[PDB]
Design a protein around this ligand. Structure first.
Ligand SMILES: [Mg+2]
Lengths: 110, 56, 295, 131
DNA sequence: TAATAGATTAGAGCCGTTTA
């Protein structure tokens, strides 16, 4: 439904993110909706200049200061764009599946 | 064509424009402000043109 | 030397949360050793620093950062040398599952210079204060009173405790000792023993590694080699596994910082802090008793 | 060869009823239990101390990264973690321009007069002590 | 009163910031 692209200094010129952004703009053109791709600018050193052409045309969300204000911008933009019962238990059970698999107490005699 | 457009300096003058827009919507008039109604992740200049010369 | 504690003691009369911040902490870059790196090298911990103080602020602004997961009143008491002054810190679970983590204050004065044991009258007063605090919070008397300290409980104070207590209330006394020289290493890996392991010595005594390697952090709560804390059930009847689990839970209440866990019970640490603050200045009737005025 | 039992690490609860192990990850994932609306910061100190606290608060609003992030998790930001405003532009400042006793009484009197006389409410006073 | 130990107890200080 939406494509948030991180717009840090490293994340705006790397090859993989560039190709993902390119196919994102292609599917945006296919979907004929301008409310698809959202840049999240987080990096103090990276100004609104020097940013990639493929995202320079679009309106970024200011995550440079107070990441939570950018989070609120993301939330009310999603509500304004009809982006489709919130349950934090899903994230609670998902946090240790991926982020804690090399970091756990596995049974082994020591 | 039924819309009101308010242009302003973005970094400095926001409180006045926000208050003016809020009062205008309270009065029933439809308004468009870049710090209130300009969507995120959208070509801002193209939408400003559309609002200015299409519905204003 | 006694600047912070006496500031807080003088501020105890009029209830105002306060946080003391040394200028060398907030901006450690500009203060230097005059011949190289700054005096307080906080580069590796700056974000962690920005964590801890934030929680401290959020703790002293009336916010509850986290709860714990009934009918058990933990009472950790610590002795202060001046005459001796015993000051305690209590916690339990409210009927709404809220973590009541107030104190047990109004320090009790044992006149002996080195007897870290409360007199029968002072022990009775401390215990009954804890029981009525529990009564007014949970509407009922506690089912079990897990009373712990860094000192062994002598016979006369134990008798005072069990005569001031009411019926159907089992209280067990626990002794926590730090710096006990049992340096258990790990033969295979280069990282010390993982945190949470317990070596049982007796049905009443054991060594618990409340600090050490944390699998979740891929590192250690303690530099060098961890020092297990000795947990002994000197008084009362309780299961040592249950006591170890409860004390591991109590090692999660460190609201004075934001750290995965601390090596000693937070009840004892906070009782020590409030006792030092109380002994810093003159006697004050009915101290505030909530830790936001001390930590 | 004595057997070492294991006590499962206790889980601390957070907002919405979710429990986590590390206070940092739990705070940055679900947030604190109760919500306060913000911190009315009070500063008691010299002008340089106020400037230092101002700068550090402004840095606190934005994320700060540890040198090693896997062991000690980073700070997403106070507004990101706790969800209550602690901006630096809402500070009640009190400037200061037996020796320990008098140094203590200076800040004590400042806090007493600012909490008694001043109309601005301070959730918690931060004694920014020089060095 | 002094001393010689062990067991506990308590303070204070002091540096590093948890091996990737
Ligand atoms: Mg503290």
């Amino acid at each position: 439904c939406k494509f948030l692209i991180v717009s840090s200094t490293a994340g705006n010129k790397r090859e993989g993110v560039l190709k993902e952004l390119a196919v994102a703009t292609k599917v945006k053109k296919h979907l004929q909706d301008d409310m698809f791709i959202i840049p999240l600018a987080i990096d103090e050193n990276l100004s609104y200049d020097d940013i990639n052409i493929e995202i320079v045309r679009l309106n970024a969300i200011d995550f440079k200061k107070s990441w939570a204000k950018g989070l609120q911008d993301l939330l009310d933009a999603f509500e304004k764009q009809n982006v489709p019962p919130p349950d934090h238990s899903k994230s609670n059970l998902l946090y240790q599946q991926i982020f804690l698999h090399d970091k756990q107490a596995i049974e082994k005699e020591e | 064509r039924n819309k009101i457009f308010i242009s302003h300096a973005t970094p400095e003058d926001d409180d006045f424009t926000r208050w003016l827009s809020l009062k205008l919507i309270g009065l029933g008039y439809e308004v468009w402000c870049d710090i209130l109604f300009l969507d995120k992740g959208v070509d801002f200049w193209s939408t400003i043109e559309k609002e200015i010369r299409e519905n204003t | 030397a006694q600047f912070h504690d006496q500031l807080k003691a003088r501020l105890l009369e009029h209830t105002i949360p306060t946080q003391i911040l040394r200028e060398s902490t907030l901006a450690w870059r500009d203060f230097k050793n005059t011949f190289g790196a700054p005096i307080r090298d906080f580069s590796k911990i700056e974000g962690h620093l920005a964590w801890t103080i934030s929680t401290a602020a959020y703790y002293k602004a009336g916010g509850k950062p986290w709860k714990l997961g009934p009918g058990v009143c933990y009472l950790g008491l610590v002795y202060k040398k001046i005459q001796n002054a015993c000051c305690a810190a209590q916690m339990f679970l409210d009927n709404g599952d809220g973590t009541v983590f107030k104190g047990e204050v109004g320090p009790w004065y044992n006149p002996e210079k080195g007897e870290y044991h409360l007199k029968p009258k002072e022990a009775k007063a401390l215990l009954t204060q804890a029981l009525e605090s529990y009564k007014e919070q949970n509407k009922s008397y506690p089912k079990e009173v897990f009373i712990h300290a860094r000192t062994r409980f002598n016979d006369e104070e134990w008798n005072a405790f069990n005569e001031v207590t009411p019926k159907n209330t089992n209280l067990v006394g626990v002794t926590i000792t730090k710096s006990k020289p049992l340096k258990l290493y790990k033969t295979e890996g280069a990282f010390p023993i993982m945190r949470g392991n317990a070596y049982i010595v007796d049905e009443k005594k054991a060594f618990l590694w409340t600090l050490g390697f944390v699998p979740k952090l891929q590192s250690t709560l303690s530099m060098e080699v961890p020092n297990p804390i000795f947990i002994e059930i000197n008084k009362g009847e309780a299961e040592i596994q249950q006591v170890l689990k409860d004390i591991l839970a109590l090692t999660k209440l460190n609201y004075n910082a934001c750290i995965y866990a601390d090596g000693e019970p937070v009840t004892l640490r906070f009782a020590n802090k409030i006792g030092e603050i109380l002994t810093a200045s003159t006697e004050i009737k009915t101290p505030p008793l909530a830790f936001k005025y001390y930590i | 060869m004595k057997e070492l039992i294991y006590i499962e690490e206790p889980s601390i609860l957070f907002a919405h009823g979710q429990k986590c192990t590390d206070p940092r990850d739990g705070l940055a994932l679900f947030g604190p239990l109760n919500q306060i609306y913000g911190i009315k910061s009070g500063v008691v100190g010299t002008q340089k101390g106020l400037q230092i606290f101002k700068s550090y608060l402004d840095k606190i609003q934005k994320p700060i990264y540890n040198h090693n992030n896997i062991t000690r998790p980073m700070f997403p930001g106070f507004e990101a973690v706790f969800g209550c405003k602690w901006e630096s532009q809402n500070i009640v400042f009190k400037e200061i321009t037996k020796r320990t006793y008098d140094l203590v009484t200076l800040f004590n009197d400042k806090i007493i007069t600012a909490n008694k006389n001043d109309e601005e409410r301070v959730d918690v006073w931060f004694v920014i002590v020089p060095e």
